[PDB]
Amino acid sequence: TVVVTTIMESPYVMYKKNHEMFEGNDKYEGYCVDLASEIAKHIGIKYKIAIVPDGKYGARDADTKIWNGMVGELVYGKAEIAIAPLTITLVREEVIDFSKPFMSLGISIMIKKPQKSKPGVFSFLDPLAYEIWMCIVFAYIGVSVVLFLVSREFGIFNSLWFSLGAFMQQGCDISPRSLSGRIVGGVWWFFTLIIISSYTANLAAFLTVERMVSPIESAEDLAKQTEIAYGTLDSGSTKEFFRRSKIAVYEKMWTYMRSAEPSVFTRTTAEGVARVRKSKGKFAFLLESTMNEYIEQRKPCDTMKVGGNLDSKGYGVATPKGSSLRTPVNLAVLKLSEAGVLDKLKNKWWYDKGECGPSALSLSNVAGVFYILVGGLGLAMLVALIEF
Amino acid sequence: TVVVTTIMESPYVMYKKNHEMFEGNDKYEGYCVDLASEIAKHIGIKYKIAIVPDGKYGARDADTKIWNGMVGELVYGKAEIAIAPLTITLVREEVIDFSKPFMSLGISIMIKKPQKSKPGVFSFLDPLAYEIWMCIVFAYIGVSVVLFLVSRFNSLWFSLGAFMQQGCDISPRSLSGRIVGGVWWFFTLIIISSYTANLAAFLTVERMVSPIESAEDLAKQTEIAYGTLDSGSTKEFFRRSKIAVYEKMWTYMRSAEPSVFTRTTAEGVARVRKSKGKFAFLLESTMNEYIEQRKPCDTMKVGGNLDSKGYGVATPKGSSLRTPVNLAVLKLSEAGVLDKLKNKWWYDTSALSLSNVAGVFYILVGGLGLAMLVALIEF
Amino acid sequence: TVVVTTIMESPYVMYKKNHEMFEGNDKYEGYCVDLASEIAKHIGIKYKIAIVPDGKYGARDADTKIWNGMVGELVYGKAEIAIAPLTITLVREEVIDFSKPFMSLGISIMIKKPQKSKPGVFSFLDPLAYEIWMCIVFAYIGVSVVLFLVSREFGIFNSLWFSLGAFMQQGCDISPRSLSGRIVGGVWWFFTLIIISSYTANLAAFLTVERMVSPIESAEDLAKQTEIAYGTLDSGSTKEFFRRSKIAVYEKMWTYMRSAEPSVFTRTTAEGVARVRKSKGKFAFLLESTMNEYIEQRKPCDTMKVGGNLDSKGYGVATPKGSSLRTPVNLAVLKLSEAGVLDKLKNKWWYDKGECGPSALSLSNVAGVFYILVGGLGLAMLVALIEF
Amino acid sequence: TVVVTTIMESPYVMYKKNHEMFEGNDKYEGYCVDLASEIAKHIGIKYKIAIVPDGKYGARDADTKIWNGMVGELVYGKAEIAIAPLTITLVREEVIDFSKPFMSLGISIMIKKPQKSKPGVFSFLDPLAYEIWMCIVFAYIGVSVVLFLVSRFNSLWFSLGAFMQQGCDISPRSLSGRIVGGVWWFFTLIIISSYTANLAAFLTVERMVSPIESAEDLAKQTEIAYGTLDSGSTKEFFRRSKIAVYEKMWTYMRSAEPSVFTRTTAEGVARVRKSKGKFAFLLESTMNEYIEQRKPCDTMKVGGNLDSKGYGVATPKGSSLRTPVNLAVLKLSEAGVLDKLKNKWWYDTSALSLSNVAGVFYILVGGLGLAMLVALIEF
Ligand SMILES: NS(=O)(=O)c1cccc2c1c([N+](=O)[O-])cc1[nH]c(=O)c(=O)[nH]c12
Ligand SMILES: NS(=O)(=O)c1cccc2c1c([N+](=O)[O-])cc1[nH]c(=O)c(=O)[nH]c12
Ligand SMILES: NS(=O)(=O)c1cccc2c1c([N+](=O)[O-])cc1[nH]c(=O)c(=O)[nH]c12
Ligand SMILES: NS(=O)(=O)c1cccc2c1c([N+](=O)[O-])cc1[nH]c(=O)c(=O)[nH]c12
């Protein structure tokens, strides 16, 4: 029975919910658990699923050169095949034989979802700072009274009506027919015109800039701006990609990361994911494309994928140099890719089994006006009854 | 000397402008030629560049079972190392040994860059969501009712004038009825400013959003016809597909007249443009990007790669250079050479017309025409 | 008498206006003609000004390696010193001895001056295409007449007044008091509101974009956009700077130039200068900083300098390897730079002798309204007299 | 081994973060160290890096006539090749032989990046040029006169209301007088829209223009005090200057109390910031750019280089490496190395408050206060 060496990394492999009830190769489920099954079916090789005792993908001990993880299991002749998300890299392929890629991974940017749906009820006041709304109400009462004094028709219940009507630019009523009174109206009209023009102009400024801001969609975008903090992992090739790169865009990124504080290199991948979710659109974690898609397709469904692939990588099946099954596996992997079976399994374990299946002004943006209108009309009805 | 073989498929291989003066391997320029140098320099091997005579990539002629094109040259000893954009397939792999993919491609969607959209009839409502417009009418009725109800203790005419920044017909004198007027005067002010301001962003900033944004979207929309190649790998990929998305595409294409399957690539690249964006092409992700960055630069790309393929260097069974070459490819990929070459060779207001606001002239004409009927009805 | 070899390139050297009347070293004038004089004064070496018979700065014959121009004169022992704008380059300094730079030149971008001062009289109509102004006048007459028909107070001389007043949003007059008539007013008011709001919104779009456009001020700016066509000269180091460069910004520029058509490499420097002047802000010639400043400081005074120096170069005095005057000249050049004499001469020949010594809305931008207002009031006066 | 000498003037030389672990030439990082490598590799020479003990650049002590600092080390055989930002001067050149300038610098102007400007009292007039505002008043008088003149065949009140998008007091019924009203109603409409639209661009787009834009400008303006160094080359450059621009600067500084000449560089870099932009520093064009790209990144640069200087590598008289080094410098300059190193080590809306519109509240308060007097005068 061929000994398989796979790694416990969702969704590729993950123990079943009620796994204690099961035994053997049936206790495990995951993308890899279907890939190995399908490959066996074609070739015809009994496969006993075994788990990497340690939990490392593979990296020769810097001190003793000893191979670790499943890469070590293969070379040391303890596992005849390796079905896992094992990247095709020199060091690895220098000791083992890799199958043609089954999933072209790459680098991708993770950010939080827009979630920009909190238009406060009183959002029609943002252009003009409340301190001016406190200075208008006073000025209005301050102006209305002066129009009464200098005119003693223009009583104290009609002056408030003229001043209020003049400010809203829909007022005719009765015009001041005294030179002294007309002075008050003229300055109030000039005061009215500036405020209305200022409010209209400033409001357009708020909307256009919010319409011009765009989310990051490329590597240049993430680097040209330093507002969002973009970090990777301390270990792994997620950062090495830049420690020996040559493209200007990448070179700049490395500089920012190695300088910005605190440590952008999160201790673990799980930390980076949480950081983005708990930063309100201020941290952009960098992780492999495959795992990036998985995270976005699970609850709380707040992360997202932007752009494409900065680099080009690929996974594959692994076998020791000189295995009796180097051609059969390679042909079977190609046969699955042509038949679309890899896309079927990818869809199943990423979307089908994903808990989450899939410019204009809204009423909320102007909710404050519609509320002070229903309440205002409600105040009137009371008055009409109280006077009655 | 090693007789390398490739194909004159731009931008992978092309003839240098001054091809007549140049001699030897220097006569040809492209991505493959640069890639060839990177490999040779690594393995220290003298290599001569040749071109396949029939220009075919490789397809076994079942009638004769003789491999044609580049794949044929390799299996019959007439070639050496095909450094060409040859896709990795099962049938090819049975006769030749490929290398680890230098670059990865996938079927894509090819459409013309979105040109200025035709202004819809009622395009003068965009600043405020159509929902709001309904609530504005509902609020107009609300206030108009209150005015009458309060007064009993011309209302519609007053409210209509106040909303549209016009003069006031009358002036309420009661406290009960002045509150109703003041609030509405304010409500409309915010609206008028909200419409005017938002309408400015719509004109200042342009977006020209593309209709098709992914694969699924394209399939559903029937207006935008999508055609592949009559003999390309794409057509086969769909025929043998069972993913509902691609399934529906087959059905559509099977009964899509006039025939959408362009004979060659040239035909498709032209047809797409001359169709004003009503036609879409499904080709590889490499030639698509090249065209988008090739004059007149009028086509675009939308949607993720439907299926994953891979271009690879091929070697005859048992070639002594199989491992040297493979390892050299991987070295370039980690060093960024495979990407430096690819990026280099591939990538390196308005006055408002009548159409934008036409809608209101239809309302006006209608209004000033319906008005007449009312007089006829009355008298 | 020390033989000097200078080049006829303004303003460094240029024959006097009435030069035929003069002879000897007094016939020539220019920046270099003062530099050589000042150096002599300090050292004390009789200098006979001689002109390079050919007219080439210096470049060994690709076929015969023979040195040409003043660089050839020095090596071949025909000139003891070379006072000229001779750049300090390897090839040259490998055969002759250069003095410490007297003028730090570099690369610079030449463009035409803004000259954006042509606001047509009728510029208040740009936001709304004339075709809509033709559709408003008709609609106005079309609406005014319908208000008359359905109401037969609202005659034919008062309906034109109400319709005109309603459109300008300053009208009260008399309100339609018939349900049939009120329908006409309501739609006209809705028609009025949209046009005014559309005009105000669209006008803001024109101004903000014209306020956001900015002239090129760096090398990235010129490359990121392909609207302006930037070219150099076919010969000279003005283009070589990029044929072997390594900076991304520069590498991109070379690509554009070698591809864009027609030939961006102007036959001569004079062609490039004329091209910019005769392209309406569409050609950006690239030339040395020193000559760039000179051109901008001469009639018709239309070119300009933007940005700084993409590279770093330097001129100097030249002498043959082993000249009896290598230290005296070098010390004298440094003595002039400290004393500010070089800046004095630079100012004199670039600015002092330069024929050219050195956001808001203007009345022109709204000139059409003020004209149709004076004429309109002039029409009224006629009517008032004709009726009288 | 060659004992190279330099100076710990950042960014030219600095200690690597992990200096304690590193040994030898690797302990120091900077521009000079990178430049040293480029030269050594070219000339194939083993070089050891040393630091000048007293940190001085070089100034002859007239009392003893002994050269100090880096220049002293060279002339006294205790050093070799000073690859340092040593400026080329006449006195230095008499004892040491420099190289062709690797990089060129010049005196500059150092100011704090322009922060949001305080809103002027009458900042509500910016959209329309102050000229227009005058002609608007002139046009108001023009029409008001015509109305009376025409009618004779309240005028000021009508015109004032019409201009400020308010209601109409009356309605002229004569053709003679209706023309006068219609044109003004139109004129104001264009103005109101022109003000509202232009005011939007002023808020949307921000410019934050810097007060000082060149040398001449700085000299004239007295508010923005400009100070140099108490012992730096700059101070000497001005003292011996006769260009009117710099002349005036000397006069100002000679009687500029409190003393503007900052003792060190650090003091100037701080003083400039803590002065909220009222103080300006005149330093070199190299340290200025470094600070602008150094945290907290709050300073800026304005104006062209007042005078031209040059940093150069120095050699003792008759050094056998004088020509090798010089030629190596020129090679780097043409190859772009001198610039690659320099660029790398150096460079690598809002809600309107009351202040913006305050002016109108002063007009209003004034108007509603002047109005009262008129009543007192009348009665
Ligand atoms: N899960 S992960 O967080 O994205 C992730 C992070 C870091 C390294 C990974 C890795 C994954 N992976 O995708 O499972 C596979 C993989 N394969 C290799 O061969 C290797 O060397 N490193 C990795
Ligand atoms: N250029 S194309 O129009 O998109 C295109 C269209 C159709 C078939 C192609 C093809 C390209 N290509 O891109 O390089 C390569 C390629 N290679 C093979 O081996 C093969 O069988 N068919 C093809
Ligand atoms: N005048 S120019 O049109 O700008 C100009 C154009 C082309 C080459 C120039 C050059 C100038 N120059 O500035 O006088 C000096 C100079 N010096 C050299 O040593 C050399 O090789 N080439 C040149
Ligand atoms: N860093 S600084 O604050 O602008 C500065 C201020 C003052 C003197 C400096 C100087 C620098 N510098 O820039 O490198 C170099 C330098 N070199 C000399 O030889 C000399 O005498 N004085 C100086």
From Swiss-Prot, chains A, C:
The postsynaptic actions of L-glutamate are mediated by a variety of receptors that are named according to their selective agonists. This receptor binds AMPA (quisqualate) > L-glutamate > kainate. It is found in: Cell membrane; Postsynaptic cell membrane; Cell projection, Dendrite. Residues 200-365 are extracellular. Belongs to the glutamate-gated ion channel (TC 1.A.10.1) family. GRIA4 subfamily. Residues 154-169, 170-172 dip into the membrane without crossing it. L-glutamate binds at residues 85, 87, 92, 237-238, 288. Residues 173-178 are cytoplasmic. Detected in cerebellum. A lipid is attached at residue 172 (S-palmitoyl cysteine). The chain holds residues 416 to 836 of 902 of the full protein. Ionotropic glutamate receptor that functions as a ligand-gated cation channel, gated by L-glutamate and glutamatergic agonists such as alpha-amino-3-hydroxy-5-methyl-4-isoxazolepropionic acid (AMPA), quisqualic acid, and kainic acid. L-glutamate acts as an excitatory neurotransmitter at many synapses in the central nervous system and plays an important role in fast excitatory synaptic transmission. It comes from the Eukaryota. Homotetramer or heterotetramer of pore-forming glutamate receptor subunits. Tetramers may be formed by the dimerization of dimers. Interacts with EPB41L1 via its C-terminus. Isoform 3 interacts with PICK1. Found in a complex with GRIA1, GRIA2, GRIA3, CNIH2, CNIH3, CACNG2, CACNG3, CACNG4, CACNG5, CACNG7 and CACNG8. Interacts with CACNG5 and PRKCG. Found in a complex with GRIA1, GRIA2, GRIA3, DLG4, CACNG8 and CNIH2. The M4 transmembrane segment mediates tetramerization and is required for cell surface expression. Disulfide bonds join 301-356. Palmitoylated. Depalmitoylated upon L-glutamate stimulation. ZDHHC3/GODZ specifically palmitoylates Cys-172, which leads to Golgi retention and decreased cell surface expression. The chain crosses the membrane at residues 130-150, 179-199, 366-386. Coiled coil: none annotated. This is Glutamate receptor 4.
